[PDB]
Write a protein that binds this ligand. Structure first.
Ligand SMILES: Nc1ccn([C@H]2C[C@H](O)[C@@H](COP(=O)(O)OP(=O)(O)[C@H](F)P(=O)(O)O)O2)c(=O)n1
Ligand SMILES: Nc1ccn([C@H]2C[C@H](O)[C@@H](COP(=O)(O)O)O2)c(=O)n1
Ligand SMILES: [Cl-]
Ligand SMILES: [Mg+2]
Ligand SMILES: [Mg+2]
Ligand code: NA
Ligand code: NA
Ligand code: NA
Length: 326
DNA sequence: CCGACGTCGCATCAGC
DNA sequence: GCTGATGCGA
DNA sequence: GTCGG
């Protein structure tokens, strides 16, 4: 990328503000600025040039001037030397360990991978699985493997009930050549915004995927969201594939377009689009787009018959999934 | 200046 | 048990 | 940290 040094610096700062400072709005601000700089089609020559972009303000412009001049950021060089910040940033790389638990572990003297493995009984279920697969979960998934995973999920879903439709979303649907995990949107005509005519709709699919040894572990599970672990089958004498994170979201079938807009992302794209919706007097979630009254109270859901209908309400030209990788 | 910043599912805990 | 935060996650 | 009223 043209501005990878700057965007990496802002990402590291975002991660510091999220994991150490526990400042979620600074995290979002740094990530928004990193994203707008990442798609800027010029090699940035000054902080003033970057400050013209939405989400880049005075302070990031100053950091960009320091980084352009020296190749580094003193603020980050200090953060790296802080042992508490270093430890907290490492611990939060385990799935299920967030900013609060990381700081509590550091207080308790649990600061390393060796420390975590010594103290499994101090971990909740999610954290225990996150530790088990710590290395695997930092590996990316080649699109070729995503296609094999898609084949399994779609065919196994069809064996349970031919009326299910499973849609792989996330970076995969945005056409990425690799993905961090697999995101599966699921619908069934028995589950709509008006009624649930069949119990265990998500459970039956999870169960079938466990039965064929595709799903290997569960991080959390409810009526509409599964968060877990999966693994492709390997052939004779082959090294095993890495275990992969999988998310399955069962969405009311009549609300598929809002659901697939949400689950396609990216996360920053969704934040930007929902923020624009609010400025336009609407609120968007994974189910509906609703107007806002003068009181700021959301009104009744608006008719939606395509993803583009949602863009139209907020006066955005349509963006294909491949152009949503913010 | 300063209030707002996207929205919500599941796990966990506190208070009753 | 229920209800309402809070944490961590999508 | 940045934006917008
Ligand atoms: N904070 C978030 C996180 C996710 N999401 C939505 C949008 C994401 O695209 C979708 C899947 O979450 P994810 O973390 O797997 O993001 P992806 O877009 O798939 C990433 F590119 P990756 O390929 O690394 O998983 O959930 C969101 O709305 N808000
Ligand atoms: N998981 C899915 C995917 C699509 N669909 C529906 C939405 C549309 O009515 C129809 C067209 O699908 P597509 O948008 O993939 O062309 O399929 C669904 O009900 N559940
Ligand atoms: Cl809704
Ligand atoms: Mg994903
Ligand atoms: Mg605003
Ligand atoms: Na700007
Ligand atoms: Na984590
Ligand atoms: Na995911």
């Amino acid at each position: 990328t043209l501005n990878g040094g700057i965007t990496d610096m802002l990402t590291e700062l975002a991660n510091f503000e999220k994991n150490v400072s526990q400042a979620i709005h600074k995290y979002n601000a740094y990530r928004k600025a990193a994203s707008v700089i990442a798609k800027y089609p010029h090699k940035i020559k000054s902080g003033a040039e970057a400050k013209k972009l939405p989400g880049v303000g005075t302070k990031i412009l100053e950091k960009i001037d320091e980084f352009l001049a020296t190749g580094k950021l003193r603020k980050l060089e200090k953060i790296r030397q802080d042992d508490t910040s270093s430890s907290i940033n490492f611990l939060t790389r385990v799935s299920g360990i967030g900013p609060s638990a990381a700081r509590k572990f550091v207080d308790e003297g649990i600061k390393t991978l060796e420390d975590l493995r010594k103290n499994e009984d101090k971990l909740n279920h999610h954290q225990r699985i996150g530790l088990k697969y710590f290395g695997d979960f930092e590996k990316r998934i080649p699109r070729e493997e995503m296609l094999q995973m898609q084949d399994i999920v779609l065919n196994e879903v069809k064996k349970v009930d031919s009326e299910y439709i499973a849609t792989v979303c996330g970076s995969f649907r945005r056409g990425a050549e690799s993905s961090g995990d697999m995101d599966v949107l699921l619908t069934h005509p028995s589950f709509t915004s008006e009624s649930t005519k069949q119990p265990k709709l998500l459970h039956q699919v999870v169960e079938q995927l466990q039965k064929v040894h595709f799903i290997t572990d569960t991080l959390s599970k409810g009526e509409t969201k599964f968060m877990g672990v999966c693994q492709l089958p390997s052939k004779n004498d082959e090294k095993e594939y890495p275990h992969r994170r999988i998310d399955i979201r069962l969405i009311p079938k009549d609300q598929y377009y809002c659901g697939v807009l949400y689950f396609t992302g990216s996360d920053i794209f969704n934040k930007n689009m929902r923020a624009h919706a609010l400025e336009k007097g609407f609120t968007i979630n994974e189910y509906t787009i609703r107007p806002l009254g003068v009181t700021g109270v959301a009104g009744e859901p608006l008719p939606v018959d395509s993803e583009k209908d949602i863009f139209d309400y907020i006066q955005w030209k349509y963006r294909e999934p491949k152009d949503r990788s913010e």
